[PDB]
Amino acid sequence: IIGGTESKPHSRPYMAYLEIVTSNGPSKFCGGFLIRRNFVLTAAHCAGRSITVTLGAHNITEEEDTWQKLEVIKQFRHPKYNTSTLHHDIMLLKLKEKASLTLAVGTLPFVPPGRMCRVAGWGRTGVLKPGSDTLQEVKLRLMDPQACSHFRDFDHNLQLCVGNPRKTKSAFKGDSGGPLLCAGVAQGIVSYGRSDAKPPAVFTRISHYRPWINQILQAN
Ligand SMILES: Cc1c(S(=O)(=O)Nc2ccc(-c3ccncc3)cc2S(C)(=O)=O)sc2ccc(F)cc12
Ligand SMILES: [Zn+2]
Asked: Which atom, in ligand 1's list, is nearest to the CA of 193?
């Protein structure tokens, strides 16, 4: 998150911190959010050999009594996901057991969005900056789809265009898979943008994918 503020600890209790063992070699990190006791919603590009989810966290180098750290037992990547265009950049993760609902660990609820939205994550705080140890959040403006016309594979039906280009406020690297909320409702999933961090960025439009989500939930 660039231009954001350190979240009030545990104020976004749906937030998940994903530790992904990449199918080939090293470890990477994404965001995500808990939508049922044993399901996390994230980006398809965050898939890997295996994934761990940490719930209840604020500072991800500091274990707390709030934490619940859970292995992923099944990855449901969108079947039409495209590694090149990032169409359908959405993935459900089934957890090995159900999270305990606590003040610090809760599910996020699910009708057309307004302009001022908010995203949170532990990603980089600037182009060439480290990840944040602490959860950061920022308010971003939902833009018309034209504002993203420069992304050749953008598609208004599948995707939100997020972040006023005049400001530096943006989701960035490491913020993948985290939710965009508009009026307390989850509308987007951080997907991609410019590697120089100039907004807007591209998020997955969650409403488009609601039948697929319902299908996976109802059946697992
Ligand atoms: C994740 C990410 C990157 S990245 O540079 O880490 N990865 C990235 C960047 C661009 C694209 C892409 C470009 C053109 N068309 C489709 C996808 C893809 C990928 S990724 C996440 O697939 O490596 S830059 C950026 C900017 C804003 C943001 F919210 C998220 C991101
Ligand atoms: Zn705490």
From this structure: 26
